[PDB]
């Protein structure tokens, strides 16, 4: 029932259509996925899908200012066996990349980046409070409204996008990936905080912090800055060993990312901690001296 007029870029979720709500006049981000419609024990809907979609709708209720809202949900049985589910998200044109892309020479003042990081951690903490882990944060899905408000998007869509394969993985950006994920040790909440560090540094750089070709390459770029983790800090039962890398020591943080204040550097050290257990949460980072 929505009218589509323009189109949003492609990431790890396929074609995202920009549409009009003939009622509110607001723009909405149409996002489609094809779901299971019939089973071998009677017609059923994948429990995991109906749950996660309902979990998102629930968040809308809280109306947090720092997260994209799931306005509506449409379903059409186009195929005989499966069904196409359209998630109608709250649309916002400008993202973080285009926001940094139109940034003057001195970049963003200390207070402007400060505010952006504050709202960024406010929404994240909210997500974690509701048991939702954004598995892949990046300037592409961190939307910023014209008003200056930061709204996170593309978050709790884990089990909904496992039923499809478009090839997005081939170009999947693993720059903001957490070390444990690359290592496949254990999926935790603190996985998000690592992505927060990579983007917080890109605010004072206007160019990604780490850039790896594959998975192994991504780790290489990481250890060359924070330094090789200790024996007690390295996880057990993983594919990649610690001996596969040359022993690196901790490097000056402000040297890699200039224009960082006293409390700014001390925060990034806790942000980009290898051990997820020692990595400080969004709640602790929000109440830091820097913010």
């Amino acid at each position: 029932r929505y009218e589509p007029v323009a189109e949003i870029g492609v990431g790890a979720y396929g074609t995202v259509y920009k549409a009009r709500d003939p009622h509110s006049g607001h723009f909405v981000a149409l996002k489609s996925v094809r779901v299971p419609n019939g089973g071998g024990g009677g017609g059923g809907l994948p429990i995991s899908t109906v749950r996660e979609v309902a979990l998102l709708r629930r968040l809308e209720a809280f109306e947090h200012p720092n997260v994209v809202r799931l306005m509506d949900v449409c379903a059409t049985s186009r195929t005989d066996r499966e069904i196409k589910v359209t998630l109608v998200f709250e649309h916002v044109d400008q993202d973080l990349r285009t926001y940094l892309d139109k940034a003057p020479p001195p970049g963003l003042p200390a207070e402007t980046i400060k505010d952006l990081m504050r709202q960024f951690l406010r929404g994240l903490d909210f997500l974690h409070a509701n048991c939702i882990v954004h598995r892949d944060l990046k300037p592409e899905n961190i939307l910023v409204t014209s008003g200056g408000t930061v709204k996170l998007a593309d978050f709790g869509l884990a089990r909904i996008y496992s039923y499809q394969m478009a090839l997005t993985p081939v170009v999947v950006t693993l720059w903001y990936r957490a070390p444990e994920v690359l290592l496949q040790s254990t999926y935790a909440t603190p996985v998000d905080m690592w992505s927060v560090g990579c983007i917080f540094a890109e605010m004072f750089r206007r160019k990604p912090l780490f850039c790896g070709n594959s998975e192994a390459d991504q780790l290489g770029k990481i250890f060359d800055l924070i330094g090789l983790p200790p024996e007690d800090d390295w996880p057990r039962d993983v594919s990649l060993p610690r001996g596969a890398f040359p022993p690196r020591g901790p490097r000056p943080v402000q040297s890699v990312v200039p224009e960082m204040e006293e409390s700014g550097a001390q925060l990034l050290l806790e942000m980009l901690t290898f051990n997820p257990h020692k990595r400080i949460s969004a709640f602790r980072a929000l109440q830091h001296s820097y913010l």
Binding site: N37, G38, G41, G42, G43, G44, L45, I47, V50, R51, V53, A54, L55, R57, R58, A61, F62, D72, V73, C74, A75, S77, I83
Partner: protein, 228 residues
């Protein structure tokens, strides 16, 4: 801790309380007695399948919300009931009900084909917003905030759930806030298990409800029980 969870739960209730009394929309064939007749059948099914205590009331939540905006017909009532059942279970049970198990409960009047389609139909009409807050979701929290030990919570909690099921069957409580139904039926239970003023003020102080409301509510539930 728990205090942060209560505040949020309370906040949400308004969203999962049926908008209006719909017996003026389904005026052609729907009737309050049929809505209750269907309720007892849903109760039988859940008690039969030993579903989580939360499913039934949740299913009834879906029912009311669907009947609020969609004028359905008499013959499709049983079909609608099963779907709500299904969904409720799918959302709140480790091993939810299959569409075949519900199919045999409808005495095969409802084909598995109908169940698949109507599941999608109900979801769309409820905008896939099924993570609703129901009375039952208040039990644990308001029980912890009492002067009772977990050593005896077993019986109190069980008895309180029949009042909760009672409410879900009786249309008079349909529009009631989940918190009031919970704090009210849990008061009817504790008072029937071993004064009243000190008790009602303790319960009200928790959910932020008024002592007046709680009493009238608690009394109405006890009255509805004896006349069911």
């Amino acid at each position: 801790g728990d205090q942060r969870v209560l505040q949020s739960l309370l906040r949400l209730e308004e969203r999962y309380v049926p908008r209006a009394s719909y017996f003026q929309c389904v005026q052609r064939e729907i009737k309050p007695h049929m809505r209750k007749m269907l309720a007892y059948w849903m109760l039988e099914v859940c008690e039969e399948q030993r579903c989580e205590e939360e499913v039934f009331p949740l299913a009834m939540n879906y029912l009311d919300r669907y009947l609020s905006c969609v004028p359905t017909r008499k013959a499709q009532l049983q079909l609608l009931g099963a779907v709500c059942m299904l969904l409720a279970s799918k959302l709140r049970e480790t091993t939810p009900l299959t569409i075949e198990k519900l199919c045999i409960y409808t005495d095969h009047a409802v084909s598995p084909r109908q169940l698949r389609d109507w599941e999608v139909l109900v979801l769309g009409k409820l905008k896939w917003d099924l993570a609703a807050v129901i009375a039952h979701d208040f039990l644990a929290f308001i029980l912890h905030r009492l002067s009772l030990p977990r050593d005896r919570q077993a019986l109190v909690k069980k008895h309180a759930q029949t009042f909760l099921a009672l409410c879900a069957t009786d249309y008079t409580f349909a529009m009631y806030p989940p918190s009031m139904i919970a704090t009210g039926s849990i008061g009817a239970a504790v008072q029937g298990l071993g004064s009243g003023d000190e008790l009602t003020e303790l319960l009200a102080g928790i959910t932020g409800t008024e002592v007046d409301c709680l009493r009238a509510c608690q009394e109405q539930i006890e009255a509805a029980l004896r006349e069911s």
